[PDB]
Amino acid sequence: GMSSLPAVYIVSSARTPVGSFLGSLSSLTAPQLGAHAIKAALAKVDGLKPSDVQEVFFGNVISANVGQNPARQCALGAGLEESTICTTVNKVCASGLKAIILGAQTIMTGNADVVVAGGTESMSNAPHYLPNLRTGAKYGHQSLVDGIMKDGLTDAGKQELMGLQAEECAQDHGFSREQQDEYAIRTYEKAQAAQKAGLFDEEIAPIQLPGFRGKPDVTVTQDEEPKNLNPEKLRAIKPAFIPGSGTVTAPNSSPLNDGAAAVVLVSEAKLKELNLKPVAKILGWGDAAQQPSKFTTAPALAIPKALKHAGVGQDAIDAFEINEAFSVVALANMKLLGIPEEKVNLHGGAVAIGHPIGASGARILTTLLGVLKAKKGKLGCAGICNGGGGASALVVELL
Amino acid sequence: GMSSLPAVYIVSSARTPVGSFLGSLSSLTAPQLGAHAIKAALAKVDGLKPSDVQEVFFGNVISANVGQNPARQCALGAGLEESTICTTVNKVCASGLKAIILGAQTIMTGNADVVVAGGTESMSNAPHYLPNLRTGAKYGHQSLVDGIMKDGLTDAGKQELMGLQAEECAQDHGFSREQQDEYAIRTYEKAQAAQKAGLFDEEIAPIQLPGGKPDVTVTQDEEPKNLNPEKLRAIKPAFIPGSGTVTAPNSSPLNDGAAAVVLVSEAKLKELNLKPVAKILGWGDAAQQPSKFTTAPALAIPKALKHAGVGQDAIDAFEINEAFSVVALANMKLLGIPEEKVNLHGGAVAIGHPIGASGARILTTLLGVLKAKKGKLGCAGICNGGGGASALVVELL
Amino acid sequence: GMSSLPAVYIVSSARTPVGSFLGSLSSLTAPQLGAHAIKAALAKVDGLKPSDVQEVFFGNVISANVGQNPARQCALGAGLEESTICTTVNKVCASGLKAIILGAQTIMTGNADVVVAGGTESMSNAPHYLPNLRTGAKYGHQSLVDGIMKDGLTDAGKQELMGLQAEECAQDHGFSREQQDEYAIRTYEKAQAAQKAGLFDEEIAPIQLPGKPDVTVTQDEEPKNLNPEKLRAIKPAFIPGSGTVTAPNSSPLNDGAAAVVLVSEAKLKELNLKPVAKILGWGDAAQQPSKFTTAPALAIPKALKHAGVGQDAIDAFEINEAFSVVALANMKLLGIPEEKVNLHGGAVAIGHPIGASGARILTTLLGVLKAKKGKLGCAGICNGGGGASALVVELL
Amino acid sequence: GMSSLPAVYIVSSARTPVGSFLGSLSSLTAPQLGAHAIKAALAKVDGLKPSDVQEVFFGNVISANVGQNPARQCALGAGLEESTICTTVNKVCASGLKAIILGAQTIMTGNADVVVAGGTESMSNAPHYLPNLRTGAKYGHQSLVDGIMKDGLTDAGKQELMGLQAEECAQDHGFSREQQDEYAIRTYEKAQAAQKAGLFDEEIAPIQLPGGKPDVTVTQDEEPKNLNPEKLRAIKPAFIPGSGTVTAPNSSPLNDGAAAVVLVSEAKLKELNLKPVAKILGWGDAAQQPSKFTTAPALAIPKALKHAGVGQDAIDAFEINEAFSVVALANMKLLGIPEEKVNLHGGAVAIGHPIGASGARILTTLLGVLKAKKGKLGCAGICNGGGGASALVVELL
Numbered sequence A: 001g002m003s004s005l006p007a008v009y010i011v012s013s014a015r016t017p018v019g020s021f022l023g024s025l026s027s028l029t030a031p032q033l034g035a036h037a038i039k040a041a042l043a044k045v046d047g048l049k050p051s052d053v054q055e056v057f058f059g060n061v062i063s064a065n066v067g068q069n070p071a072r073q074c075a076l077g078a079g080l081e082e083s084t085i086c087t088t089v090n091k092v093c094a095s096g097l098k099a100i101i102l103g104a105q106t107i108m109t110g111n112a113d114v115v116v117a118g119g120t121e122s123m124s125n126a127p128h129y130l131p132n133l134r135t136g137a138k139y140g141h142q143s144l145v146d147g148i149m150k151d152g153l154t155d156a157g158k159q160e161l162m163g164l165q166a167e168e169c170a171q172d173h174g175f176s177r178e179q180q181d182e183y184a185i186r187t188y189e190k191a192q193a194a195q196k197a198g199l200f201d202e203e204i205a206p207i208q209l210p211g212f213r214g215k216p217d218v219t220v221t222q223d224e225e226p227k228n229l230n231p232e233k234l235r236a237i238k239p240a241f242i243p244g245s246g247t248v249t250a251p252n253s254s255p256l257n258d259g260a261a262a263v264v265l266v267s268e269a270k271l272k273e274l275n276l277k278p279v280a281k282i283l284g285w286g287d288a289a290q291q292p293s294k295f296t297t298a299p300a301l302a303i304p305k306a307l308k309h310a311g312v313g314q315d316a317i318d319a320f321e322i323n324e325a326f327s328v329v330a331l332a333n334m335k336l337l338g339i340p341e342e343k344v345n346l347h348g349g350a351v352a353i354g355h356p357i358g359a360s361g362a363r364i365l366t367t368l369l370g371v372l373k374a375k376k377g378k379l380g381c382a383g384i385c386n387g388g389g390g391a392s393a394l395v396v397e398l399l
Numbered sequence B, D: 001g002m003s004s005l006p007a008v009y010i011v012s013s014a015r016t017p018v019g020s021f022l023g024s025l026s027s028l029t030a031p032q033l034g035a036h037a038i039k040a041a042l043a044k045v046d047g048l049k050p051s052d053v054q055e056v057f058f059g060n061v062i063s064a065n066v067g068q069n070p071a072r073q074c075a076l077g078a079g080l081e082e083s084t085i086c087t088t089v090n091k092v093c094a095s096g097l098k099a100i101i102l103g104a105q106t107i108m109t110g111n112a113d114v115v116v117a118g119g120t121e122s123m124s125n126a127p128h129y130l131p132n133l134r135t136g137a138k139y140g141h142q143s144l145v146d147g148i149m150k151d152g153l154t155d156a157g158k159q160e161l162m163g164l165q166a167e168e169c170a171q172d173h174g175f176s177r178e179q180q181d182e183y184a185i186r187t188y189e190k191a192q193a194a195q196k197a198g199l200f201d202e203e204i205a206p207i208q209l210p211g212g213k214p215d216v217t218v219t220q221d222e223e224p225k226n227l228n229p230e231k232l233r234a235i236k237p238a239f240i241p242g243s244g245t246v247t248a249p250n251s252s253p254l255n256d257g258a259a260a261v262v263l264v265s266e267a268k269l270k271e272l273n274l275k276p277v278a279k280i281l282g283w284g285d286a287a288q289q290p291s292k293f294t295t296a297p298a299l300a301i302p303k304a305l306k307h308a309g310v311g312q313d314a315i316d317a318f319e320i321n322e323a324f325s326v327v328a329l330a331n332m333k334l335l336g337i338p339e340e341k342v343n344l345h346g347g348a349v350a351i352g353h354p355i356g357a358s359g360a361r362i363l364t365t366l367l368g369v370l371k372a373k374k375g376k377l378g379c380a381g382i383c384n385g386g387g388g389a390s391a392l393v394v395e396l397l
Numbered sequence C: 001g002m003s004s005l006p007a008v009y010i011v012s013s014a015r016t017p018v019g020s021f022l023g024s025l026s027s028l029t030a031p032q033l034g035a036h037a038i039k040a041a042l043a044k045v046d047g048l049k050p051s052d053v054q055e056v057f058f059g060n061v062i063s064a065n066v067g068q069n070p071a072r073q074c075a076l077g078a079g080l081e082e083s084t085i086c087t088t089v090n091k092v093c094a095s096g097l098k099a100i101i102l103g104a105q106t107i108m109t110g111n112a113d114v115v116v117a118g119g120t121e122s123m124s125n126a127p128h129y130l131p132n133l134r135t136g137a138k139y140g141h142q143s144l145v146d147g148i149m150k151d152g153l154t155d156a157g158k159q160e161l162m163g164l165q166a167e168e169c170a171q172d173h174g175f176s177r178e179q180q181d182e183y184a185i186r187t188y189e190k191a192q193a194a195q196k197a198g199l200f201d202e203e204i205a206p207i208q209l210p211g212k213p214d215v216t217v218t219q220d221e222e223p224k225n226l227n228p229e230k231l232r233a234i235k236p237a238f239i240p241g242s243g244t245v246t247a248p249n250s251s252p253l254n255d256g257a258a259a260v261v262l263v264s265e266a267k268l269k270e271l272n273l274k275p276v277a278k279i280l281g282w283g284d285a286a287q288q289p290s291k292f293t294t295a296p297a298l299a300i301p302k303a304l305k306h307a308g309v310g311q312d313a314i315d316a317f318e319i320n321e322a323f324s325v326v327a328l329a330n331m332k333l334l335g336i337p338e339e340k341v342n343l344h345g346g347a348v349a350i351g352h353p354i355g356a357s358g359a360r361i362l363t364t365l366l367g368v369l370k371a372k373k374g375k376l377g378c379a380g381i382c383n384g385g386g387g388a389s390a391l392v393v394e395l396l
């Protein structure tokens, strides 16, 4: 259903390394990470200046203490002009991909010719909340609310952590502790393999952290999590969400993480005016939702909807990015859609790379473009579930 | 601009009363206020069921402790289906209007036929933050950050409150304390006049609060009755001691509230034979230096008029959001818009400013002004911290 | 065995009004209340200058955010000389009486001739704690600890509120909810009758809160709250459904301070002071922590034996009412008839500023002795953790 | 003097290692440290059982979050009977010594024959405070108060940290940065020499910390090893930038630790045929202007000596607590006490200053100094914030 509308081209993309929780990038705020990703993306487009960017959509979930309009801070921090229109987007884990859809639509309705879209998250710098200080609590202990748990990882209706709802997925779709563990080992191995072959080198923009008080500078170059794989330890670890007989574990779940990613989108007209070389074309997209506790399999709706919107058959896709909120999320959506694992997350997924929730929808699209390049594919599809019951998906053609 | 693209119709709108800070609505969360507006807006459309809504865009600025995806909680709380696509939008004070823009665009690209959009804010329930508990602070007094100040009212680059940058507006454009106060008095008078004549009755959906106390219905905006002109002219300034021109009476307050609009495509309007209230003619976002956000509407409003193919003179009524009295004064001066065409039922200085909601709140009020004043063409413009503004042009049908 | 040691004389006493939680006195800090009672107590001794006070012992339980040495701030706030030796004492609810014992001992060992002792508590201004901020806590909800609950009202071992162990007392010694309610009503009425008769007027030093208009606080805030039928119908407070302990038949949370002025035999003679009373003896005792409620049944006999005074020769007792059941159980255990217990009401009706109550009941006891024309009094007060303190006095 | 009061004997003492701030003992609470010291001190008395202890006085300054009656928790944690009378004492840094004085007095008035006294502090586990949650604060950032700073280290009248009032001491009595620095190096050298010679082995009760982690034993004080004379003389001042003379290396640190003594009457000493370690000869408290607390020992020490019937020249060893290097220098100047008789095994600048315990810690160390150096008469003095000091004189038997 998109072919009757103006075309939207990706002319570049970039991402930070993904840092572990309280880890390599924990000194940087979410706008600093997003600015880094936006600046790096634009630096790759010869013939396009940062001052050409008219509008920004940037995902961010746990915005507490980030300050006014995280997307605007990202844009100005990146060196974009003060004239740039900036909107922050929250569709929990789908934020980064919905931001890109919104950027594409803004080109399609004629209101921009150059848009930067993506997402950022600093889970390390998510604060705690004191909820009752204005009116007071006269007597009794109080709770300091962990903002990650409250605004990122707990389903609002059932007050269940995403991890507990992944257990519901395992039960609904018949995936044992062992199948999830072997999936996680495989995705770590793919991430380590791509890392070692240099296959993330182009998409990653290393971060230089200036030393303080004479201390040496630090360059963060690679994702922090992939090296953590220890197969023997992973198979023996205790469950994370259901004691004893739980199947979901910290090793086979996505971690908490810091990172950002950005894509640069241009209209057909701007591509011709500036004689730009496009990397990919956006073919279509789809959002879908169902029962909140079944958010884990919402991609099974979004992906067919995105393929239909793009006019592409599922069998024509050369590579899928199915975001690994949990290992069981990938396994269940592959099962429901009949997609073989050999076509899914070819450079590993968020279980091994990390899951900065506001950035991951854009992070996986950046990685998808690198997969299509390295594996000489043409058609890709990215899908990512989000807490609350939804998912977003997008189809790209590598040019 | 927009005339080459599919039409988008507003088939209804609704808003909560605007409650004062820690006031009439402080017991309700932002999604409870949002659900209330959404539900009330859909109840007005004869022939459209809540299950027909496909997608929601809802503004919300200070989202700390609201929980996962405020917009999704608004939608589910309103009785929408679990299949509904929900996104929360933050463009600070322009959030509720940008949400409506994104909703219109989603109809225009063919991805939805029925969209609900608007915004909500519970400033009363914004928490305080403890920023460094994960890594620890070994020794020394720490600080608890007020979420309203940090994420709502402080410009990130300068670390200045909006009211301090409103003083910049008064100096840049030469508006005295007296000019700002008399503006504020006039907009309170217009709000009180509209209240007494029942002109907000249609747009407001009253809220029923279960009582240890009797049961309370909140039917009115809480702020308009506070006008005391003698006290207003005598009060000390709020942001610069001694020489300041900006005061709490001539500034917008902190407030709680939500507002929603229902958007449909041309095909859906015809399939269901729905009666549209208005048509969206065009919109425009603009931005400039962050500390000059006060006059970004002087950019966004011409841009939206150009997108709509409408001349500024053909507009029958404007809503220029009153972040501060000086904001309305400065944009009227720069654009050459007479005050006789501006905020005809009062603005946010008198009505309240729940920041994530106000962009949609002013559009709901504009539709009422157009009907009451027998206007056809309306334009709403709202500035936002960080240097931005958003504006929207509508035609009353 | 005090008859062979130096005699200790009470030449005066004074207390603040006792304010309700977050109530009449909640704008004052604990040292501000303490300073008020100290200065007022000294104002009644003609011929004793505040600069004559050599040493201070002052009780205080929830000292968090009060600042360095609450007792020293009380002394300096009251106008005492910077040469004054100042120690803060925490024996939970017994702090104000143990402080008086320690002051009397410092007279007896010859290290001072003029001592001020007593207690203060501002439960209103007790803070909340954030315990793991130094090392940090990486992921998960944390707790803000109510300092009243943590440092004042919870037994350290069993980790249970005092009210829950008051339920133990009701069970162990067999006192129904009805009996506890009937005792609460009797002590409220006595407090109201002493109040209406002006019998608290001399011991209370009214507090002036400057504004816009000034506010004078003259009376205890709690006694008036009595509502017999509402009291008899309220749900329990520590065990839902079957509980016998309620907020109306328990002590409240309160703010207040109290002070007494002690001198030696020699100083009394030197400046020709008129003593109000003489300390005859004291006793501290302790037993099982959850049984703290009947620890005064050990400390009251110990104090009487130390004073060389029989239990039946006592004209009035102050048995502190941590809960109504505490007074009933100690009356039952010691064979004390209620007719000579808390004749102007007790903490259930007057309030329980925990660091001050040990001195508050002694000041009230001295007033009961004058009004009822008695000579011998004994004050006993239990404290969380399992202990109790008691003191025997003779009205001169 | 105390010649007219009954005799009070010390039959044993013991202390924990002194751990650094957030250091080797940071996992232990104040009552766990106190109970450890009490239990070890009683273990040294052959013929006295723990069930024989009748009353405890225990110092503790920053008692926030420690729970009801820290002294009672120390006593029960040590295995004392539930019949033990327990009182917690706060005279700031003098707490541990005022506690011993009160325990002696309770023996002297006949109310006990066996008393345990001392003090404890876990500065590592002092919390932060939220001061106005009960009443609320409607709008604006709030402050968390560090309990160490508020309840341990700030003069209440002037709101000055102790280290700032230490500079006053340096200016009042004319001690330069260099003199304070050379003093600190000397006391670190003395602490290290005592350590290596095992002179602390008797007084210290090592602490066993369980780990599937391997178990760790803390046997030494953590601070003495930190001496770096080069860094010390070049470090920047800690309380007055630029011109200041007081530094972190020449000040006492923040620390954890506890210490205890066991006291008996003459009758109980005879009944049980106990060999006493020492006899308490006298004591004295004194106080002056709060900001001049650094020199309050110069009143308390002569007062204690007069109470004990001992001339100053008769004393074989003094413990003058090193709240700061300048504090020991000033008191040696005022009293004419040569340094050759002061803190012979080092002081709190090198050993640590767990403030609620230091008053008892220096008496434990003093008894070791008297034995090691063939002395008979010793005097400990310790100042406290607020203007006070406490001092006590003992005879080694």
Ligand SMILES: CC(=O)SCCNC(=O)CCNC(=O)[C@H](O)C(C)(C)COP(=O)(O)OP(=O)(O)OC[C@H]1O[C@@H](n2cnc3c(N)ncnc32)[C@H](O)[C@@H]1OP(=O)(O)O
Binding pocket: A092, A093, A152, A153, A162, A163, A188, A228, A229, A230, A231, A233, A234, A237, A240, A249, A250, A251, A253, A254, A255, A256, A325, A326, A355, A357, A385, A386, A387
């Ligand atoms: C909206 C959406 O997208 S839905 C999903 C959104 N995101 C989420 O829900 C986040 C899910 N993940 C989480 O909540 C957190 O990462 C948690 C709770 C699972 C982590 O729990 P933790 O116990 O703190 O994880 P942790 O990193 O400490 O690992 C625990 C153990 O597993 C070990 N381990 C971790 N990863 C591996 C690995 N690949 N291989 C072997 N061992 C591993 C660790 O070494 C550790 O062992 P140890 O502590 O005994 O030394």
Ligand SMILES: CC(C)(COP(=O)(O)OP(=O)(O)OC[C@H]1O[C@@H](n2cnc3c(N)ncnc32)[C@H](O)[C@@H]1OP(=O)(O)O)[C@@H](O)C(=O)NCCC(=O)NCCS
Binding pocket: B093, B152, B153, B162, B163, B188, B226, B227, B228, B229, B231, B232, B235, B238, B247, B248, B249, B251, B252, B253, B254, B323, B324, B353, B355, B383, B384, B385
């Ligand atoms: C301005 C602000 C700080 C209010 O501060 P405040 O001191 O708490 O304001 P108050 O409501 O207490 O009003 C103060 C006084 O003015 C009086 N007052 C308020 N409105 C009045 C009116 N219309 N007429 C006469 N008097 C009025 C009040 O009665 C009060 O009197 P008092 O001192 O005797 O109590 C706060 O509302 C604010 O920050 N507004 C800006 C919000 C914002 O920036 N939004 C984003 C914009 S881009």
Ligand SMILES: CC(C)(COP(=O)(O)OP(=O)(O)OC[C@H]1O[C@@H](n2cnc3c(N)ncnc32)[C@H](O)[C@@H]1OP(=O)(O)O)[C@@H](O)C(=O)NCCC(=O)NCCS
Binding pocket: C093, C153, C162, C163, C188, C225, C226, C227, C228, C230, C231, C234, C237, C246, C247, C248, C250, C251, C252, C253, C322, C323, C352, C354, C382, C383, C384
């Ligand atoms: C027991 C305790 C938790 C009370 O909690 P609380 O319910 O908040 O106390 P309140 O004053 O609010 O009482 C609540 C109700 O009781 C009523 N009430 C209280 N005292 C009353 C009285 N004398 N007569 C009639 N009604 C009374 C109140 O009117 C109120 O009614 P409401 O439900 O309409 O509000 C608290 O006061 C406490 O812990 N006291 C013990 C203190 C202590 O342990 N000290 C140390 C002992 S060792």
Ligand SMILES: CC(C)(COP(=O)(O)OP(=O)(O)OC[C@H]1O[C@@H](n2cnc3c(N)ncnc32)[C@H](O)[C@@H]1OP(=O)(O)O)[C@@H](O)C(=O)NCCC(=O)NCCS
Binding pocket: D093, D153, D162, D163, D188, D226, D227, D228, D229, D231, D232, D235, D238, D247, D248, D249, D251, D252, D253, D254, D323, D324, D353, D355, D384, D385
């Ligand atoms: C003085 C005080 C503020 C310490 O400040 P601090 O800077 O946080 O402590 P530090 O350990 O970091 O010391 C600062 C520097 O001096 C170094 N240092 C400490 N002891 C040293 C020593 N003996 N030799 C050489 N260097 C030393 C430290 O290694 C550190 O060096 P760095 O800058 O390279 O890290 C704190 O300990 C204090 O307030 N003490 C007074 C306690 C008190 O008042 N008690 C009551 C008295 S009445």
Ligand SMILES: [Cl-]
Binding pocket: A289, A386, A387, A388, A389, A390, A391, B069, B072, B086
């Ligand atoms: Cl959703």
Ligand SMILES: [Cl-]
Binding pocket: A069, A072, A086, B287, B384, B385, B386, B387, B388, B389
């Ligand atoms: Cl902006």
Ligand SMILES: [Cl-]
Binding pocket: C286, C383, C384, C385, C386, C387, C388, D069, D072, D086
């Ligand atoms: Cl006890």
Ligand SMILES: [Cl-]
Binding pocket: C069, C072, C086, D287, D384, D385, D386, D387, D388, D389
């Ligand atoms: Cl003092």
Ligand SMILES: [K+]
Binding pocket: A042, A043, A044, A045, A046, A047, A048, A049, A050
């Ligand atoms: K470029």
Ligand SMILES: [K+]
Binding pocket: A201, A202, A203, A204, A205, A206
């Ligand atoms: K690169």
Ligand SMILES: [K+]
Binding pocket: A250, A251, A252, A253, A254, A255, A351, A352
């Ligand atoms: K993992």
Ligand SMILES: [K+]
Binding pocket: B042, B043, B044, B045, B046, B047, B048, B049, B050
């Ligand atoms: K309807």
Ligand SMILES: [K+]
Binding pocket: B201, B202, B203, B204, B205, B206
């Ligand atoms: K209506």
Ligand SMILES: [K+]
Binding pocket: B248, B249, B250, B251, B252, B253, B349, B350
């Ligand atoms: K106003």
Ligand SMILES: [K+]
Binding pocket: C042, C043, C044, C045, C046, C047, C048, C049, C050
């Ligand atoms: K007098």
Ligand SMILES: [K+]
Binding pocket: C201, C202, C203, C204, C205, C206
């Ligand atoms: K009086």
